């Protein structure tokens, strides 16, 4: 029982297809430029070099690379699940090691102060520090079940200085210098080599025959497995400390026979947004996720070396991403393994599996927006260099839009450059043929192997390379795309396009942009053909063709 | 967006989905059930045309042999772009014929398009706090502050701000592709070329049929010179590798409707098994299991 109001309608203008044919005749009667570019191998290399020069010119130079590993740990032996008894038997021994080291930097002084505070804890408070929350008792030094207090009296001058400092333009690395690139690639290769080092129904039948045998069995002895388990325990402890009650108190934990020590500073709780938890780690030097340059300092013990990292504030989302780093790496490696089996038709070697597992694990540990954007672009550049004509150079500037901060970004850029140059070089020879497609045999300009990214294997179809880059891209948590930079970029894009619309509207009149432009003024101007502007005759003719 | 904006976009989207689902067997590749059918038909037509041979007639009852070759363009023509006009759909739906005897609902769609032409873009709190923290760089900061007179919202025109106009834009792009096909046919009555297209979700596949000399002789050049000397000035861009000209005419026609084929994300390559396999796989599945 509702009647549609009359509102308003539109009078159909007659228009003519012959007028647009005349415009086509006039437009084709000149020189026309092709919006796409040919891929030649030298073209992509020259684009990369020119963009390197432009990026070096646009951003200030930086000689000290920043940090990429959010957590700094090391392992030489095997790892076991952490329990309360293991926690105590490791904390005591870790404090015993720490109290024999001469401090040299204020962070080391704070570490020594915390170790002295913990090793001098009373038996009652020490016992209560490891008690379930239903059973714990309020004390004078320990208040929350897994925390303790540390007042200014126990803090030294250096520790007070760091607490006061913590309580209280954009540069980029020189990409056009081979020394920096070589140093970065050497560091990352060393990290991967350490990670890959070994440490001393019928569906179930199929699983144990193939997957459990060739993926889990191979990766069980890898260093990355135990490193991931250790990071998982660390993340569990950090999440436990993240409570509103437990956030503003100090804490201490140790793992792996006292080798790795976890320190927690009083940080704002994670219930409210924009909150970071501050922690420090001390470990023994050895193979694993170790970066000497990014370490705060190194301490010399008797025939041993002990390293401490700087204050390391992390967010809730990145903490949760780290907690599942090992599982995400395993799922990504399983996806890569399935794709490799589908492509090559056989099973991967145990070296390629280790390499791809290490790469995925390192990607999962280091969650940054730059890497996510780089992989998102790489998802599309590979089709660009696989085809004949494509808009690859603009994709190269898309790669180079953001600054470089860490050595992982340099390493990934180097690998991507090598891969893209190789793919473009492959395209040189294009032979025609005659094979069946659908139900008719037709020609094909088929180019013949596709190099991989995380291993030395070669693929039969580049869809496998696309799947590899896709798997690497999805290893980055959904939510890093809501950073300040992206929001600013989208706001600025919308505003800039609105300003362009306003400029066109004021230059050509309100109604001209509103209702579209007639065709005679288009042919008398020849500039009206652009975005954000449409021809009424064109809309008429398109409607007529669709109506046909 | 707000509730009235959602209502208007829902009206337009429902009307255009209803008017577009019927031609989904040939032009619009509707995902889920019949996505592959339209593209398969287009590819079959293209391969059938390529299997044939062309014989252009000369003035003195001659026949010049030309080779029928195809190459394909993968472009996201219907993907939402910030630079666009929502007013261009008004005249499009003004006389898009339907089976309804009356013109009441069509006027409602017209009014909804007029209403969604106007919009206001509002600042976010976090962005305001970030800009208030030491705004230093001149151009973008000054223009951003200038766009908001009161510092909270500004007026935007044209773009629907990623509203639900996917089917409407797909249909409009199909209409302009048909217009380009008819125009190319009209310009060349003797150059019987080929052109087929199919739109799936946000991207589309374009098939262009061009001709190249077989013996690499001067007969094609002689015919081009004779045509250009006879008053046909539009043959200048056709003598050598005219698929450039086909794609350029298609792009210019699309730009006439404020549709821009982006230089990025768009790849053109000749016939290749891997290319078509990748396109079919992308059409069949959109979300990787990883």
Curated annotation (Swiss-Prot), chain B:
It comes from the Viruses. Mg(2+) binds at residue 203. Residues 60-246 form the RdRp catalytic domain. The N-terminus contains the endonuclease activity (endoN). The central region contains the RdRp activity. The C-terminus contains the cap-binding region. Classified as His(+) endonuclease since it has a histidine upstream of the active site that coordinates the first cation. Belongs to the Bunyavirales RNA polymerase family. This is RNA-directed RNA polymerase L. It comes from Hantaan virus (strain 76-118). The lineage of its organism: Viruses, Riboviria, Orthornavirae, Negarnaviricota, Polyploviricotina. The gene is L. The chain holds residues 897 to 1186 of 2151 of the full protein.
